[PDB]
Amino acid sequence: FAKLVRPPVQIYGIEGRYATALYSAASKQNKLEQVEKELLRVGQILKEPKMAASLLNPYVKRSVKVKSLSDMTAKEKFSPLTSNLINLLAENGRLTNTPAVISAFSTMMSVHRGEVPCTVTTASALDETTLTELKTVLKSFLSKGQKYVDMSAKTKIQKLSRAMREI
Amino acid sequence: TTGRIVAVIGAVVDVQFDEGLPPILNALEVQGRETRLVLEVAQHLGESTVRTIAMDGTEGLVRGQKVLDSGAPIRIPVGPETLGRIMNVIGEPIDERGPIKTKQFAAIHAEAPEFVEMSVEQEILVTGIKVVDLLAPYAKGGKIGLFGGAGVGKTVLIMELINNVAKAHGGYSVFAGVGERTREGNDLYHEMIESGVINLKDATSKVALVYGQMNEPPGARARVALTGLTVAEYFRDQEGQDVLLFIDNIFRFTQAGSEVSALLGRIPSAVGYQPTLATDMGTMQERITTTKKGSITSVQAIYVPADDLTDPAPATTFAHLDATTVLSRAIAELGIYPAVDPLDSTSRIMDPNIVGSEHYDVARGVQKILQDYKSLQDIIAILGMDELSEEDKLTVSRARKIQRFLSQPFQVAEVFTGHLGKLVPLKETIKGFQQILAGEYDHLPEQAFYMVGPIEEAVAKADKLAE
Amino acid sequence: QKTGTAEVSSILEERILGADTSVDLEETGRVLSIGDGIARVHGLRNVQAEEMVEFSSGLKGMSLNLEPDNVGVVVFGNDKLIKEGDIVKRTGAIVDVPVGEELLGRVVDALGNAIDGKGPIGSKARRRVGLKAPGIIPRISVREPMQTGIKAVDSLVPIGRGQRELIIGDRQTGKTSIAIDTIINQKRFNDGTDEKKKLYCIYVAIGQKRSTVAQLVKRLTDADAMKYTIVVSATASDAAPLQYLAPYSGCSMGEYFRDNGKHALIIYDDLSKQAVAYRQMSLLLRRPPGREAYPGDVFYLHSRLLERAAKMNDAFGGGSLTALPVIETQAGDVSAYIPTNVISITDGQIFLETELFYKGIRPAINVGLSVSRVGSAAQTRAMKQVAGTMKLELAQYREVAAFAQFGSDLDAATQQLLSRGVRLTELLKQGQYSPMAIEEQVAVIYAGVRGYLDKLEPSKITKFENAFLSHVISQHQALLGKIRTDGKISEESDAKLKEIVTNFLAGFEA
């Protein structure tokens, strides 16, 4: 019934379906950012030498795994309206999945903010702007300052080409 | 509202809607095409997305393309200004004569004439085709079906039908070629302008044409028949008129339904038809009917896939008929056109209290003797002919005569036959056979009954073949 | 696929926020998806298996799959009226139908609603369409005749009350007529004074076109049969679950008469088309396909239904429901999945054949294949003492039929059986809508089965029986009407018959 804040990143179609939820669950209370960081933290509350004996453990089950996740929520920097995307993955048996659910939370966050096109040879241009390939030049200026059938195919073969300057 | 294509396979496009989820059946609008593209909604997969069939090819679409909720089911140029005009799947005219001009439009997805509206009156429509009239007469304003495997004369029959029945008729006719040959539409347009049931000049056109041939998508074919009947449904309910609705070929409707069914999410059923072959047919034959308000004589032609009359398509079609003419390859192969199986063809009004004891008693007598001859058939042809009774060489003799006298040079088949057309009035048919049956021509040789009209025209060939 | 319904966005979002639509989805739910007459639904967390629910847009539905994360519901009606979101609501609904005499003459739909346009049905009672059949003990061995008044049947394929005889044959062979005439013939008992012998008729039309069911009721009306007949009808353009259901409604409305010491006859025309519908629901519900794509319960389907006709012992009313299901076979294949099943469930078959039909044998009953396991026991004694012989004689006639042709010169001993045979055969021919009284039958069979017709040209037989029948019916209403009530053929009635037969033939062929 409820209408849904589908933010123009969309992402999936089948699986990281929780993610596509909280860009709409968040965008009511504008706590997008409160969680953009909350998740970053939980991503490692579980990658402990103390949390993997349930992380991938069909041994305890939906019993002492959800009410043992009233801890790693209430306790820590959480306990909001996002201690629940866990309490869901907790019940809906997909704790083994959250990493991917956080991953996509991002790639959908940084399309309300940044843009993602990348250089050729190294890092991310993060062109957080209202226009694509506007600031693609004026941000790579901080980069300086830091014919016979066959020969046809063999010339484009070096230009923008192959295994050369790639490394 | 506005919607965006999410995915596209072959003929099935899913679409996503910000707000206005269109109800199933609702015609949707693809924004951005050099020719109009409609998407009949088919289901709600949920998450504000709807799967749909395209009423034309999806070559070109792109993930995100703009789609608009036309708010309601496909709508067409129902009305009197359709005569002489070649419509199509979605209304758009295609004889090149600029918009069909009417301010009355109806959705092609109607409900069906309730119980209480059913008419129980049936009276014999004579066709002048001997075999049908003698053994299985059609009934004014009733569902008729033309069964046929490929190439046995199904389509030609329906021509010689529209020639005879639909010419000496002062009402309205609606011929709708679903899923067959485009060549054969062009072919009929011009014969139907030579005869001028379609007249390009005045407005004396008595024939609406709807068309969606074997060159169009599954979407189209699946609905072309829904259109052509919406067209003839008007001329019925309003006028109180006598609407002649011809279809060719009502089979292509279920086949078309088949092609997309897969991509729509259906475990297939027997012979691999849709799990819905049954009801798909029902909520659609149940419309091609006759109410108290008006009458529609319907003449469908059904393809029999591989001649197997049990193939779930032609099989399920039989329930929906009042008179069925069934065509036989083995008969056609013997040169006996129209290849009607005088023992698989049936009418509801073949009742002595409807056609009279003379008619009835005479039909059934012919039916019998042909059946008896069929029975001696593998005695004789493998164990010496003259080893037969006296009684039997007699019931063979007459039978083969009867069997041939049942052929007719059709007027639309002169091109093939070689004899000038023909047409026999019911009572000269009854009389003709009654005679042959009675033993009155046991002297004239076989070929004399092959391909003549009224019985006498055989006594003609009886001497012409002599000296 | 991997995922799972309910689990996504629309639903997902709100398990985070905090959603509080009072009815914790116990008493209601909302449509997660809808197509091809299936409506997957979130919530209804308290529906029972097979419960009836109401759609926001007013439509009716049935809960066949209770899956873990959603209820799968099949839609009683066109579904353009349903969309993702619509709220679905437990109505506390019992699927039950109108019951009792107030239906005779009516034409209801699959669920019990008048559709004859004659307004309200004064249904004093309701009964649930879903009911177990009488077990082992409530019953006693079928013995009272259920006479169709068709010579071929009442002599060679007896049906008793409580029996399930199957009308089975290719299309267009007279399967439905066999049913019709049977209903018609019932009247003579219903307008008599014997309650023990009346029979109330439910005729369930499944999957046929309206122009037909209509036609049908006109004919049943012209015979003044409608007065003791209920006509339940789930026609071709009705939705699936209706058709699926119709026969069990029908069974329930007769099951009433059964349990009130009365006697009903139900026709399921056509039990093959019901199967088809149920198949459709099963497939779209995504349930494992088997042979011909039918479910694993398409036997269980029909055996639930047909085991519900019975003959209640005295201690239970003495009542009876009798079923004539009708199966369409394809190219005569009676080993196909559905035929196999029904033929298996029932206790007799009347097979009809097209060659028979055109050869002249109408009704076109193949008396060799046809059978009733109740048999002699369902027959009056009179009938028994001619039918027996006839059966045997036709049987021999059958063994030697080959020499009909290549035998115009063979042992005068078997020249005999041929003659008797073709004659007996002529006697089993019968016109449409002309059901004969049992004593009448016994007479005309007596004639042939005792020789008297042997020296008459086969042609004339159907005319002789026509006049001979008439003669006795107006004249000797005496010891005709006596053959009936006494039940047997008296040492004395034997003679008053031989007198009328031989002396009437005499003058007939003179």
Add this chain to the structure above:
Amino acid sequence: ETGRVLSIGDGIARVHGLRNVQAEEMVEFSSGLKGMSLNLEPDNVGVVVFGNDKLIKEGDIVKRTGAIVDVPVGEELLGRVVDALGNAIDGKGPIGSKARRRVGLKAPGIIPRISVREPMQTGIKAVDSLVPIGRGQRELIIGDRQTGKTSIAIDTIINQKRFNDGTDEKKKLYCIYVAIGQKRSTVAQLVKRLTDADAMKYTIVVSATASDAAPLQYLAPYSGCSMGEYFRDNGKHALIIYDDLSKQAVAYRQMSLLLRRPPGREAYPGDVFYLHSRLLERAAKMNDAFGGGSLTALPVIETQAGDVSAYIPTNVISITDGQIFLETELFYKGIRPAINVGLSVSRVGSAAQTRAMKQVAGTMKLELAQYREVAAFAQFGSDLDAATQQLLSRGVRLTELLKQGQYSPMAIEEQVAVIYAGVRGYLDKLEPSKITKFENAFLSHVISQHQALLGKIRTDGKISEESDAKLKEIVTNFLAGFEA
């Protein structure tokens, strides 16, 4: 400009990107490989690779073309041999392809057309008399393997020399010949056959064979169609021969199954009808207002043990305007070309002959479907009346007539010559075992003597009582000069 490769296998590349790619639009691959979009799904484009997908690897780069798939067109193709995409492969350096038509063209609707009236001659007595084709017709050649299905389509192109090496600009017929599924060893041996008899000049030959990728056979007969669509849409006459659609269908099946489109009957996909329907509609007889140009299409189907119930063979028969059946049985029996008259139909009848043929064979097609049945009834040695003693006394001789050599068409005039011999009853008294040494003479005797009569009938295409009269003696002037 386009994006990633998600996964690759079996000629099916999944692609994560291409977000603005048209459905049915051809992409291009890292390695320079032309692919194709067919599954536009939420999170990827499944693409059918048009060649060896070894070169492709996860992660490669796929780039849009913007274009729906298209091919070389026009006279600059005649005499060549091109693969399914138009590329030349006979080693003679590119074609002069100024004209570039799209494969995915829909067919001519109702108006652009006109009843098929134009005789498309095969030069095969059997076909040209009893199942005559006409320009715009689709006539199916169907039969078991090694029955003669191809030596039909070949004998027909080899017949079009006569018209293409002359003046009359209507009688001219340019030929395309798709070769789907066959082995190169054959395509070649076949071109060689064309070349020799000198016909290769007026004949495109698109060839997508055994070793060619799957989508390449899928597409081949379409490509070869566009090329023939030009010739019609520009006022000229084309005859395309798909050999064979059976093998094509199989190919389409592969793509479809690998694309994970749930399988139907015999594993084929739902639209496996649409496939042949749409392709085969694109042959038409354009009406004057559109060029007068045509596209006659001989599709070819191959049956198993004769089974014409097979999904496919039943589909294609429902589509074409009639067909010729083949039958190994007749073949070995002596009836070469093995045809089965009674079972072959031409849904255009005489409307597609000269009034010269029509007069010798216009009610002889319903005669060799009754003389047939009336020699299968009285097979045994007994007695039959005055009427049916003759029909047999004739036919046996008549059939010895449609018995025809191979790679040796005949011009319609000569066909009318021999057909006349019998049909008018100038053979009704000769032992069949000779009716061949006979024809082989009486036809080289009335080409060496009367180029006269041929002249007329060939031109006006009819036999006036004039022409007829001359015949009536040239014949007679021969039976008495041999036996009597």
